[PDB]
Amino acid sequence: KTVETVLGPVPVEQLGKTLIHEHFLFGYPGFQGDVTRGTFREDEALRVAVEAAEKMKRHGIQTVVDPTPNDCGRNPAFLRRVAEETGLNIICATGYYYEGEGAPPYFQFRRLLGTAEDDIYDMFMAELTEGIADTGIKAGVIKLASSKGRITEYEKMFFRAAARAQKETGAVIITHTQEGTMGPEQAAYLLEHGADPKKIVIGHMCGNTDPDYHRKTLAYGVYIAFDRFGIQGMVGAPTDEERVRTLLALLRDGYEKQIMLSHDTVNVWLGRPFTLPEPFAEMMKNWHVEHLFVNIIPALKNEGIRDEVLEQMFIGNPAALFSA
Amino acid sequence: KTVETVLGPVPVEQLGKTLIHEHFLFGYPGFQGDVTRGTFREDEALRVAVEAAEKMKRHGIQTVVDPTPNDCGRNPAFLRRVAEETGLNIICATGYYYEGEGAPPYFQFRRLLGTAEDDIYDMFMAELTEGIADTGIKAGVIKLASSKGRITEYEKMFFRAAARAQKETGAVIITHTQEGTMGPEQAAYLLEHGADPKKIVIGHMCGNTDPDYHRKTLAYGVYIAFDRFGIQGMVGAPTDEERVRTLLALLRDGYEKQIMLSHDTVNVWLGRPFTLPEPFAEMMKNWHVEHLFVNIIPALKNEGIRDEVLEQMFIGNPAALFSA
Ligand SMILES: [Co+2]
Ligand SMILES: [Co+2]
Ligand SMILES: [Co+2]
Ligand SMILES: [Co+2]
């Protein structure tokens, strides 16, 4: 009936139009060490955050799930400030990034002491039911991620703990797949440990452009997300054209009730500011929160997708997802 | 004649008896993500920190070099407070940990933008001559680290950036070698890039029992450091007896002006508290800051090492390294 947000519990019946995967703040593990030259300009970040939030509300968005990992600059207190100033419902997460590019030394160590999984589970429980640090803010989703072509042994501890925290709380699990791989695998592993398919969102599915891969994942009964619209070139990612084609093939097969969309934007980059080289800066031109509403959805309508299906993805699916 | 401490420039000839490598605080990359169950406890951490500084004091230590990497919990301000309640001179560093136990994603990204090396140099330069964050405290040494059996491309970035900064500033470079490898390699790589050998210290040299390996490293004219006394248990990694036996050989061959000692203790672990399995635990029972003065030095004296060589290592060498 309710889900935890940065401002406290909110009736699931009130989430409304939802972007399932966006980042107000984000930093690659290691930015913390570049504090001297890559300081966090609080007020400016919030200005940028707030504008982004306002651009979403301008298109009907009422809720955003910001799944920024514990080791990537998660900052509930800052999210709360954005929520207080915009009225936007913001749901944060608990979880670590994938091994390829996260901060694994800490828990790899506890793995030697043979307590990692229990410690992780203890962490998920605490952030899901008591609060994150001394902020009083609880996380609404468990964030998981796997590497390219494999779910490492390090990542499996997080998956097992996730399934266990989910059995206990009925918390939603959101995942990150790397370069269109491991979708079916993530679902199988999570289900094999008792996780509830109706509470799982396998992310970055748009990373694979072969519908049989999607169908193979959809068969486990989970939700999947085409959440990187706008990201082009970088990460051997596909194109928005390919994304649409794949999405169209699924919508026509009748999978609308298992599909969600988002951009996966990074509104304020943590650490030192950088600028992307000419070639890529161009292909990423549409990587912003208004992209789905200004370019993608109009495109889907010309292709015959009707309003009822769009509402199912942006309002109905999130509603079902967050309610047992 | 002066060196930067967490309390500003101090005169080199006033450093006195020194421990070249100790950590008041340390946390493995990822500790930050476990903030909820592993919150930092100021008051208490400060109690252990100072108590540790007081025990060192009992034995004549007036100066400690705390090279905690930027991504491993370095906290100049905290160090600053320990110095105030003890008077003890504390020199901190600027640098990142090696690939395996560090937070590589952040600078791996800049690397793709062909800017890592130059950014790292910018960071070193900034922390050695202006201040760390808004602490006003300048680092007094650059910390470098390489992995087992090799200096990866990620690590060579910091080495190059480090040689470049040593030239322009005359700053000391202190290193970490993993499992007794790469000492001669690191020294060669740094010298072959302009660094000054009398301003370098190859660390964890006590990691290799073969005295020849040391002769190789010492032949470059650099200082080496047996800085892990007390650490035994990696089952295959050096015991103190082997360390002593190796120290004795090199001192007897006349290499006293190039050697320094320490424990590499971690006084306050960052993240959630833990406990070593009883076999290892009882085997690391001498890993504290008094081990050198209560066991090692007495044992070296019982083997014929004269008071004047001990002073050369503890006072004369640190004075020469930093006097430049
Ligand atoms: Co992701
Ligand atoms: Co994301
Ligand atoms: Co070390
Ligand atoms: Co160390």
XYZ file of C-alpha atoms and ligand atoms in Angstrom:
652
model
C 0.000 0.000 0.000
C 2.927 2.361 0.634
C 6.522 2.602 -0.616
C 9.406 4.416 1.076
C 10.531 7.684 -0.549
C 13.098 10.325 0.455
C 10.272 12.179 2.179
C 8.865 9.098 3.885
C 6.112 6.533 3.022
C 3.803 7.252 0.066
C 0.707 5.315 -1.019
C 1.597 3.224 -4.087
C -1.765 4.302 -5.531
C -0.194 7.783 -5.701
C 3.109 7.120 -7.498
C 1.457 7.998 -10.804
C 3.601 8.616 -13.914
C 7.014 7.139 -13.188
C 10.522 7.203 -14.675
C 11.955 3.918 -13.395
C 15.674 4.667 -13.718
C 17.297 8.098 -13.480
C 20.244 9.479 -11.466
C 20.210 12.941 -9.949
C 23.813 12.471 -8.787
C 26.360 9.962 -9.885
C 30.031 9.252 -9.518
C 32.321 6.432 -10.577
C 33.881 4.735 -7.492
C 37.105 6.657 -6.854
C 35.770 10.194 -7.367
C 35.837 10.545 -3.549
C 39.619 10.537 -3.762
C 39.614 13.490 -6.157
C 37.937 15.770 -3.638
C 40.478 18.598 -3.857
C 39.970 19.299 -7.561
C 36.568 17.633 -7.965
C 34.580 19.184 -5.149
C 30.781 18.905 -4.939
C 29.162 22.268 -5.561
C 26.033 21.726 -3.472
C 23.892 24.662 -4.604
C 24.725 24.278 -8.271
C 24.077 20.535 -8.259
C 20.710 21.181 -6.595
C 19.931 23.902 -9.144
C 20.622 21.391 -11.902
C 18.767 18.648 -10.022
C 15.738 20.868 -9.560
C 15.623 21.960 -13.176
C 15.726 18.334 -14.285
C 12.934 17.499 -11.848
C 10.911 20.407 -13.203
C 11.452 19.186 -16.760
C 10.021 15.823 -15.757
C 6.950 17.311 -14.030
C 6.380 19.275 -17.231
C 5.653 15.958 -18.928
C 3.498 14.528 -16.178
C 6.219 12.749 -14.200
C 5.374 12.487 -10.524
C 7.808 9.817 -9.387
C 11.406 8.900 -10.097
C 13.342 5.884 -8.951
C 16.976 6.962 -8.501
C 18.854 3.633 -8.162
C 22.301 5.164 -7.556
C 24.475 2.490 -5.816
C 25.876 2.913 -2.264
C 29.390 3.185 -3.707
C 28.495 5.637 -6.515
C 27.544 8.749 -4.576
C 24.091 7.898 -3.216
C 22.969 10.919 -1.185
C 19.415 10.622 0.256
C 19.721 13.869 2.176
C 20.438 15.648 -1.114
C 17.602 13.782 -2.831
C 15.256 14.901 -0.021
C 16.187 18.502 -0.700
C 15.202 18.025 -4.353
C 11.954 16.338 -3.379
C 11.125 19.050 -0.831
C 11.554 21.735 -3.470
C 9.668 20.075 -6.339
C 7.012 17.838 -4.842
C 8.492 15.003 -6.901
C 8.356 11.546 -5.271
C 11.865 10.145 -5.192
C 12.671 6.561 -4.328
C 16.323 5.714 -3.668
C 18.045 2.335 -3.345
C 20.423 0.219 -1.336
C 23.099 -1.807 -3.167
C 26.575 -1.922 -4.765
C 27.689 -1.522 -8.360
C 28.888 -4.469 -10.452
C 32.450 -5.799 -9.990
C 33.779 -4.459 -13.281
C 33.339 -0.886 -12.039
C 32.225 -0.536 -8.442
C 34.089 -0.649 -5.114
C 34.545 -4.394 -4.329
C 37.677 -4.481 -2.131
C 35.678 -3.858 1.066
C 33.250 -6.780 0.767
C 35.780 -8.986 -0.994
C 37.664 -8.715 2.311
C 34.642 -9.658 4.387
C 34.272 -12.615 2.039
C 37.558 -13.947 3.415
C 36.176 -13.533 6.936
C 33.200 -15.541 5.688
C 30.565 -12.955 6.629
C 29.978 -10.868 3.474
C 26.556 -12.214 2.489
C 25.175 -11.870 5.988
C 26.660 -8.413 6.302
C 25.160 -7.352 2.962
C 21.787 -8.741 3.907
C 22.088 -6.987 7.238
C 22.775 -3.808 5.259
C 19.806 -4.197 2.900
C 17.487 -4.849 5.882
C 18.749 -1.838 7.752
C 18.383 0.589 4.869
C 15.019 -0.868 3.867
C 13.494 -0.775 7.372
C 15.377 1.688 9.628
C 17.152 4.268 7.503
C 20.280 5.135 5.576
C 23.051 6.284 7.895
C 21.597 8.938 10.229
C 19.301 10.436 7.599
C 16.074 8.762 8.675
C 15.470 8.015 4.974
C 14.686 4.446 3.977
C 15.505 2.909 0.605
C 12.606 1.745 -1.552
C 14.427 -0.696 -3.863
C 17.327 -3.105 -3.817
C 19.818 -2.330 -6.570
C 21.741 -5.208 -8.181
C 24.202 -5.436 -11.083
C 26.162 -8.102 -12.992
C 29.215 -7.932 -15.281
C 29.610 -8.514 -19.005
C 28.839 -12.121 -19.804
C 28.789 -13.262 -16.160
C 27.410 -12.766 -12.696
C 30.648 -12.986 -10.718
C 30.906 -14.790 -7.403
C 31.247 -11.366 -5.759
C 27.974 -10.213 -7.358
C 26.165 -13.435 -6.361
C 26.537 -12.581 -2.660
C 24.514 -9.459 -3.405
C 21.935 -11.424 -5.397
C 21.447 -14.007 -2.611
C 21.184 -11.297 0.022
C 18.724 -9.474 -2.217
C 16.417 -12.441 -2.636
C 16.520 -12.905 1.156
C 15.835 -9.251 1.913
C 12.961 -9.439 -0.589
C 11.406 -12.514 0.988
C 11.467 -10.566 4.268
C 10.205 -7.185 3.137
C 8.569 -7.662 -0.232
C 10.976 -5.007 -1.511
C 11.387 -4.361 -5.183
C 14.651 -5.418 -6.827
C 16.007 -3.430 -9.795
C 18.938 -4.670 -11.839
C 21.690 -3.515 -14.147
C 22.854 -5.830 -16.951
C 26.119 -5.064 -18.744
C 26.103 -4.760 -22.551
C 22.928 -6.717 -23.196
C 24.081 -9.816 -21.270
C 22.811 -12.003 -18.362
C 19.108 -11.008 -18.414
C 17.706 -14.580 -18.368
C 20.558 -15.552 -15.984
C 19.787 -12.851 -13.430
C 16.090 -13.850 -13.382
C 16.834 -17.594 -13.033
C 19.364 -17.040 -10.227
C 17.058 -14.713 -8.353
C 14.039 -17.009 -8.759
C 16.069 -20.088 -7.834
C 16.604 -18.355 -4.464
C 12.955 -17.509 -3.934
C 12.729 -13.920 -5.157
C 9.292 -12.806 -6.409
C 9.184 -12.240 -10.217
C 6.492 -9.595 -9.737
C 8.980 -7.557 -7.710
C 11.913 -7.766 -10.107
C 12.973 -5.382 -12.840
C 15.823 -6.589 -15.030
C 17.411 -3.377 -16.326
C 19.265 -2.256 -19.457
C 17.486 -4.910 -21.471
C 17.586 -2.473 -24.404
C 21.289 -3.305 -24.428
C 20.513 -6.489 -26.369
C 18.751 -6.004 -29.690
C 17.630 -9.596 -30.270
C 13.974 -10.112 -29.135
C 14.507 -13.798 -28.477
C 16.789 -12.706 -25.614
C 14.005 -10.484 -24.296
C 11.345 -13.195 -24.630
C 13.701 -15.584 -22.895
C 13.873 -13.127 -19.962
C 10.166 -12.248 -20.009
C 9.334 -15.953 -19.595
C 10.456 -15.842 -15.959
C 7.553 -13.464 -15.377
C 9.667 -10.448 -14.445
C 9.514 -6.853 -15.571
C 12.217 -5.641 -17.959
C 13.294 -2.102 -18.637
C 14.378 -0.241 -21.779
C 16.074 2.347 -19.616
C 18.898 3.790 -21.628
C 17.011 5.739 -24.293
C 19.271 8.510 -25.474
C 22.505 6.700 -24.692
C 24.174 6.167 -28.049
C 27.642 4.985 -29.020
C 29.107 4.800 -25.528
C 29.335 1.309 -23.974
C 28.867 -0.462 -27.309
C 25.257 0.534 -26.704
C 22.677 0.175 -29.498
C 20.835 3.058 -31.109
C 17.458 4.508 -30.221
C 16.286 3.186 -33.562
C 17.205 -0.347 -32.593
C 15.659 0.217 -29.166
C 12.355 1.239 -30.701
C 12.338 -1.667 -33.155
C 12.957 -4.122 -30.292
C 10.378 -2.397 -28.138
C 7.868 -2.429 -31.014
C 8.376 -6.157 -31.547
C 7.572 -6.760 -27.878
C 4.599 -4.471 -27.633
C 3.060 -6.220 -30.635
C 3.617 -9.600 -29.018
C 1.540 -8.299 -26.118
C 4.209 -7.771 -23.422
C 3.159 -4.246 -22.363
C 2.487 -5.246 -18.767
C 6.118 -6.292 -18.194
C 7.846 -3.278 -19.778
C 9.150 0.006 -18.396
C 11.073 2.885 -19.908
C 13.616 5.424 -18.750
C 16.779 7.306 -19.804
C 19.238 6.460 -17.066
C 20.484 10.079 -17.030
C 23.215 11.378 -14.745
C 22.154 14.912 -14.016
C 25.146 15.954 -11.895
C 28.432 14.110 -12.255
C 30.332 13.625 -9.010
C 33.989 14.535 -8.957
C 35.882 16.705 -11.444
C 33.958 17.997 -14.531
C 34.891 16.461 -17.898
C 33.780 16.935 -21.517
C 33.105 14.197 -24.061
C 35.040 14.020 -27.371
C 33.334 15.388 -30.515
C 32.196 12.032 -32.009
C 30.364 10.841 -28.877
C 29.142 14.187 -27.582
C 27.096 14.142 -30.795
C 25.495 10.707 -30.474
C 24.617 11.468 -26.846
C 22.888 14.728 -27.817
C 19.510 13.330 -26.752
C 20.568 11.983 -23.373
C 18.232 14.040 -21.162
C 15.033 13.528 -19.199
C 12.741 14.968 -21.891
C 13.961 12.638 -24.620
C 11.366 9.895 -24.076
C 8.483 12.398 -24.194
C 9.683 14.612 -27.053
C 11.220 12.066 -29.418
C 10.510 8.471 -28.466
C 6.821 8.417 -27.623
C 5.810 10.511 -30.647
C 7.721 7.962 -32.705
C 5.853 5.099 -31.051
C 2.491 6.720 -31.812
C 3.287 7.014 -35.516
C 4.005 3.303 -35.274
C 0.501 2.817 -33.945
C 1.109 2.409 -30.209
C -2.019 3.681 -28.448
C -2.296 5.834 -25.335
C -3.624 2.952 -23.211
C -0.394 0.977 -23.742
C 1.795 3.995 -22.880
C -0.127 4.572 -19.668
C 0.275 0.911 -18.836
C 4.038 1.243 -19.003
C 4.455 4.594 -17.229
C 1.644 4.372 -14.653
C 0.157 0.882 -14.438
C 3.346 -1.201 -14.353
C 5.107 0.844 -11.630
C 1.827 0.755 -9.668
C 1.620 -3.047 -9.840
C 5.375 -3.422 -9.309
C 5.360 -1.583 -5.985
C 2.265 -3.336 -4.614
C 1.998 -6.942 -3.421
C 64.738 22.624 5.683
C 60.972 22.374 6.121
C 58.364 19.703 5.532
C 54.570 19.879 5.460
C 52.761 18.276 8.345
C 49.083 18.232 9.180
C 50.144 21.330 11.157
C 51.976 23.252 8.442
C 55.692 23.460 7.527
C 57.999 21.904 10.155
C 61.797 22.022 10.071
C 63.361 18.780 8.829
C 66.139 18.770 11.416
C 63.362 18.784 14.033
C 61.594 15.578 12.911
C 63.656 13.331 15.193
C 62.787 9.640 15.638
C 60.415 8.579 12.852
C 58.084 5.735 11.823
C 57.939 5.982 8.042
C 54.645 4.080 7.565
C 51.588 3.922 9.865
C 47.825 4.442 9.447
C 45.711 6.158 12.106
C 42.714 5.432 9.849
C 42.222 3.029 6.982
C 39.345 1.492 5.095
C 39.236 -0.716 2.013
C 37.582 0.932 -1.023
C 33.858 0.250 -0.676
C 33.741 0.988 3.067
C 31.788 4.145 2.235
C 28.945 2.103 0.805
C 28.521 0.402 4.177
C 27.917 3.625 6.088
C 24.635 2.561 7.694
C 26.049 -0.361 9.715
C 29.621 0.940 9.665
C 29.274 4.584 10.634
C 32.386 6.545 11.528
C 32.702 7.264 15.245
C 34.628 10.481 15.741
C 35.056 10.641 19.512
C 36.057 6.979 19.762
C 38.336 6.887 16.699
C 40.053 9.901 18.161
C 40.593 8.045 21.441
C 42.332 5.156 19.723
C 44.216 7.470 17.398
C 45.709 9.536 20.203
C 46.327 6.572 22.452
C 48.267 5.100 19.555
C 50.194 8.357 19.171
C 50.963 8.345 22.926
C 52.361 4.834 22.898
C 54.631 5.828 20.027
C 55.620 8.841 22.129
C 56.745 6.661 25.037
C 59.418 5.274 22.737
C 60.734 8.562 21.405
C 58.745 8.807 18.199
C 58.249 12.464 17.324
C 57.170 11.996 13.733
C 54.942 9.556 11.876
C 54.275 9.311 8.131
C 50.653 8.227 7.520
C 50.381 7.417 3.774
C 46.740 6.397 3.712
C 45.703 6.702 0.025
C 43.083 9.221 -1.111
C 40.580 6.406 -1.840
C 41.263 4.527 1.408
C 39.897 6.928 3.993
C 42.551 9.646 4.210
C 41.265 12.371 6.577
C 43.802 15.234 7.065
C 41.459 17.111 9.376
C 41.205 14.113 11.640
C 44.997 13.661 11.580
C 45.182 17.377 12.406
C 43.222 16.748 15.639
C 45.417 13.860 16.732
C 48.481 16.066 16.314
C 46.895 18.706 18.576
C 46.297 16.265 21.430
C 49.801 14.819 21.181
C 52.166 17.289 19.586
C 53.328 14.399 17.429
C 54.311 15.454 13.886
C 52.132 13.754 11.264
C 52.854 13.861 7.566
C 50.094 12.678 5.237
C 50.118 11.824 1.532
C 48.338 12.210 -1.745
C 47.874 9.190 -3.997
C 45.588 6.294 -4.957
C 45.748 2.629 -4.045
C 46.834 -0.057 -6.509
C 44.338 -1.541 -8.967
C 43.305 -4.618 -7.005
C 42.536 -2.963 -3.659
C 41.651 0.516 -4.863
C 38.805 2.370 -6.562
C 39.987 2.393 -10.245
C 36.722 3.193 -12.145
C 36.957 6.978 -11.701
C 40.417 7.459 -13.257
C 39.862 4.652 -15.723
C 37.152 6.896 -17.137
C 39.339 10.028 -17.452
C 41.796 7.682 -19.095
C 39.328 7.094 -21.923
C 39.259 10.873 -22.284
C 43.051 10.886 -22.549
C 43.298 13.092 -19.464
C 43.912 10.805 -16.463
C 47.682 11.233 -16.172
C 47.515 15.010 -16.455
C 44.576 15.169 -14.007
C 46.404 13.004 -11.448
C 49.398 15.311 -11.731
C 47.063 18.256 -11.271
C 45.780 16.559 -8.128
C 49.275 15.774 -6.739
C 50.480 19.316 -7.473
C 47.410 20.763 -5.854
C 47.678 18.724 -2.645
C 51.426 19.240 -2.183
C 51.388 23.049 -2.612
C 47.898 24.509 -1.831
C 45.975 22.150 0.419
C 43.782 19.069 0.608
C 40.150 20.059 0.097
C 39.598 23.113 2.382
C 41.752 21.700 5.186
C 44.714 23.950 4.467
C 46.827 20.869 5.130
C 49.314 19.960 2.423
C 50.418 16.364 1.748
C 54.137 15.810 2.429
C 54.732 12.746 0.263
C 53.194 11.090 -2.751
C 51.960 7.543 -2.226
C 52.377 5.045 -5.116
C 51.370 1.362 -5.361
C 51.708 -1.501 -7.835
C 50.047 -4.944 -8.019
C 51.446 -8.457 -7.680
C 54.056 -9.211 -10.273
C 53.362 -6.043 -12.228
C 52.857 -2.301 -12.488
C 49.599 -2.117 -14.482
C 48.844 0.606 -17.002
C 46.449 2.141 -14.454
C 49.288 2.317 -11.910
C 51.898 3.630 -14.337
C 49.668 6.671 -14.751
C 50.232 7.643 -11.134
C 53.956 6.819 -11.379
C 54.438 9.140 -14.390
C 52.259 11.811 -12.780
C 54.363 11.313 -9.616
C 57.820 11.683 -11.261
C 56.544 14.842 -12.976
C 55.408 16.289 -9.659
C 58.572 15.300 -7.822
C 60.668 17.302 -10.286
C 58.602 20.467 -9.894
C 58.395 20.171 -6.133
C 61.090 17.944 -4.695
C 58.458 15.871 -2.879
C 59.208 12.467 -1.395
C 57.706 9.424 -3.038
C 56.738 6.422 -0.953
C 55.664 3.153 -2.445
C 53.793 -0.032 -1.805
C 54.931 -3.266 -3.456
C 52.545 -6.210 -3.337
C 53.630 -9.623 -2.051
C 57.296 -8.762 -2.483
C 57.404 -7.877 -6.159
C 58.340 -4.993 -8.441
C 60.721 -3.137 -6.151
C 63.553 -2.859 -8.754
C 60.903 -2.318 -11.415
C 59.279 0.603 -9.608
C 62.626 2.238 -8.907
C 63.690 1.839 -12.526
C 60.359 3.120 -13.800
C 60.576 6.202 -11.548
C 64.215 6.998 -12.268
C 63.715 6.308 -15.965
C 61.114 9.125 -15.681
C 63.112 11.782 -13.846
C 62.464 11.073 -10.147
C 65.211 11.571 -7.550
C 66.362 8.282 -5.906
C 67.315 9.981 -2.618
C 63.693 11.136 -2.406
C 62.166 7.713 -2.998
C 61.233 4.893 -0.646
C 60.298 1.487 -1.994
C 57.935 -0.034 0.525
C 56.985 -3.463 1.841
C 60.425 -4.609 0.758
C 60.267 -6.932 3.768
C 57.777 -8.790 1.581
C 60.548 -10.773 -0.129
C 62.963 -12.982 1.820
C 65.616 -13.151 -0.923
C 68.358 -10.628 0.001
C 69.424 -10.484 -3.665
C 66.050 -9.019 -4.615
C 66.881 -6.225 -2.181
C 70.351 -5.687 -3.580
C 68.725 -5.135 -6.965
C 66.438 -2.438 -5.559
C 69.146 -0.893 -3.368
C 71.425 -0.631 -6.410
C 69.216 2.148 -7.795
C 70.182 4.309 -4.809
C 66.699 4.436 -3.379
C 65.632 3.892 0.218
C 63.742 0.712 1.022
C 61.408 0.050 3.920
C 60.749 -3.017 6.068
C 57.476 -1.547 7.155
C 55.201 -4.455 7.957
C 56.678 -5.814 11.153
C 53.950 -7.568 13.103
C 52.071 -8.740 10.039
C 52.174 -12.518 9.756
C 49.435 -14.819 8.598
C 49.055 -14.467 4.857
C 50.463 -18.028 4.980
C 53.317 -17.639 2.510
C 53.935 -13.983 3.390
C 56.968 -13.206 5.662
C 57.162 -13.882 9.385
C 59.006 -11.413 11.617
C 61.879 -13.873 12.042
C 62.431 -13.979 8.298
C 62.112 -10.189 8.197
C 64.711 -9.852 10.932
C 67.004 -12.341 9.232
C 66.685 -10.345 5.990
C 67.219 -6.963 7.750
C 70.336 -8.306 9.504
C 71.900 -9.463 6.230
C 71.464 -6.076 4.535
C 72.647 -4.104 7.611
C 75.726 -6.336 7.817
C 76.526 -5.597 4.172
C 76.494 -1.881 5.011
C 73.113 -0.735 3.711
C 72.020 1.139 6.834
C 71.790 4.606 5.261
C 69.135 3.305 2.852
C 66.775 1.493 5.223
C 63.766 2.500 7.309
C 61.307 0.536 9.471
C 57.628 0.561 10.441
C 54.570 -1.619 11.175
C 51.936 -0.447 8.713
C 49.406 -0.696 11.570
C 45.782 0.205 11.016
C 44.631 1.768 14.252
C 41.045 2.513 13.405
C 39.416 0.407 10.751
C 36.803 2.247 8.695
C 33.534 0.490 7.877
C 31.794 -2.211 9.920
C 33.867 -3.802 12.718
C 35.179 -7.341 12.345
C 37.387 -10.040 13.911
C 40.125 -12.262 12.488
C 39.596 -16.051 12.789
C 41.415 -17.133 15.959
C 44.299 -18.892 14.193
C 45.334 -15.812 12.206
C 44.313 -13.404 14.984
C 46.681 -14.882 17.568
C 49.276 -14.841 14.766
C 48.928 -11.081 14.146
C 49.065 -10.382 17.884
C 52.184 -8.259 17.556
C 50.759 -5.910 14.969
C 50.695 -2.713 16.992
C 52.911 0.355 17.187
C 55.091 -0.868 20.082
C 56.187 -4.114 18.445
C 59.361 -2.520 16.997
C 60.576 -1.047 20.295
C 59.561 -3.994 22.517
C 60.540 -6.944 20.303
C 62.293 -6.113 17.025
C 64.858 -3.582 18.158
C 65.789 -5.623 21.259
C 66.223 -8.663 18.994
C 68.402 -6.644 16.570
C 70.480 -5.451 19.490
C 70.879 -9.067 20.675
C 72.290 -9.836 17.205
C 74.985 -7.172 17.277
C 73.345 -4.128 15.755
C 74.773 -1.029 17.402
C 72.792 1.917 18.781
C 74.253 4.124 16.079
C 72.842 2.062 13.213
C 69.415 2.086 14.813
C 69.607 5.880 15.000
C 70.719 6.055 11.395
C 67.560 4.239 10.346
C 65.119 6.016 12.686
C 66.491 9.570 12.636
C 69.314 10.049 10.164
C 67.483 8.524 7.223
C 64.128 10.250 7.656
C 66.078 13.500 8.086
C 67.989 12.886 4.836
C 64.992 11.740 2.847
C 63.068 14.910 3.658
C 65.973 17.345 3.913
C 66.698 16.759 0.266
Co 23.295 0.832 -14.724
Co 21.900 3.688 -13.752
Co 50.435 -0.844 1.718
Co 50.067 1.056 4.332
